[PDB]
């Protein structure tokens, strides 16, 4: 089951919808993928059967 | 590294200018640019960005047929290229460098313009 | 969209001056924004990325925070540095691009 959403994930007793920072953060992150990175950090592309 | 470019002057409005901008040094493959043109009396304004490595062109809200992009992988330049000049356009456009490289919608959130570039002024007067 | 600036913020050496920048919902509060200076006749440069830190060769004295939906930035000790002007470049999902403000003028007493 995929899942795209942009939604800020509270953490914390006050309620957010459009503000994030102190508590509350931005669901995606994205990868810092660079050469200079050794084995375990280097861009795998997987793909699956089912 | 030098990121300079080449300007234009005076001309008639409705016309097409031709602006350029050079690379050196640093590989060209691996980072977008962005272009952005600062006028006399107000602030930065942004227009677009494209890939060295790929076809990937992207507009803003406000000029969508105005402006377009050409690309020179072989002469590591890029070509900008403007149609149907306004009289509130005289501005100076920076050719700036971003670390990184995105290509979707949502990407933008972690662009910063790093590596600036010298701007020109150019005018369009008949 | 676009976001509001003061036109001109003074202050006199030896103390702080601090430079705010608002925004709305989708402007600050779910995008990063920076900080830009610009020399006159000159190319602007890198002051505040990710809301936190600086890149190499930047004084500590440039600090800059936020809050809610609006950022603001102090700087201490204005000399000859603080004169140029500030911009705050944000992102959003309006206009699908970078978006800029007015434009900060930054004096000395």
């Known amino acids: 089951e995929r899942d795209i959403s942009t939604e800020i994930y509270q953490a914390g007793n006050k309620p957010c919808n459009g503000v994030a920072g102190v508590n509350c953060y931005f669901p995606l992150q994205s990868y810092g993928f660079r050469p200079t990175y050794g084995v375990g950090h280097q861009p795998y592309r997987v793909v699956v059967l089912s | 590294v030098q990121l300079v470019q080449s300007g234009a002057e005076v001309k008639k409005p409705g016309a097409s200018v031709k602006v350029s901008c050079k690379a050196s040094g640093y590989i060209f493959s691996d980072y977008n640019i962005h272009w952005v043109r600062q006028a006399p009396g107000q602030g930065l304004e942004w227009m677009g960005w494209?890939?060295?490595?790929?076809?990937?062109?992207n507009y803003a809200q406000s000029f969508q047929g105005r402006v377009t992009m050409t690309r020179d992988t072989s002469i590591t330049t890029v070509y900008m290229e403007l149609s149907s000049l306004r009289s509130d356009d005289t501005a100076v456009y920076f050719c700036?460098?971003?670390?990184?490289?995105?290509?979707?919608?949502?990407?933008?959130?972690?662009?910063?313009?790093?590596?600036w570039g010298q701007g020109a002024l150019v005018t369009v007067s008949s | 969209p676009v976001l509001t600036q003061p036109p001109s913020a003074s202050g006199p050496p030896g103390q702080s001056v601090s430079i705010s920048c608002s925004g709305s919902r989708s402007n600050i509060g779910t995008n990063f924004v920076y900080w830009y200076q610009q020399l006159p006749g000159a190319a602007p440069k890198l002051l505040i990325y990710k809301n936190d830190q600086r890149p190499s060769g930047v004084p500590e004295r440039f600090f800059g925070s936020k809050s809610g939906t609006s950022a603001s930035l102090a700087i201490s000790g204005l000399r000859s540095e603080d004169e140029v002007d500030y911009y705050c470049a944000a992102w959003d999902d309006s206009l699908s691009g970078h978006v800029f403000g007015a434009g900060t003028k930054v004096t000395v007493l």
């Open positions: 700036a460098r971003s670390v990184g490289y995105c290509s979707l919608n949502s990407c933008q959130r972690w662009m910063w313009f790093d590596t």
């Open positions: 494209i890939s060295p490595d790929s076809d990937d062109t």
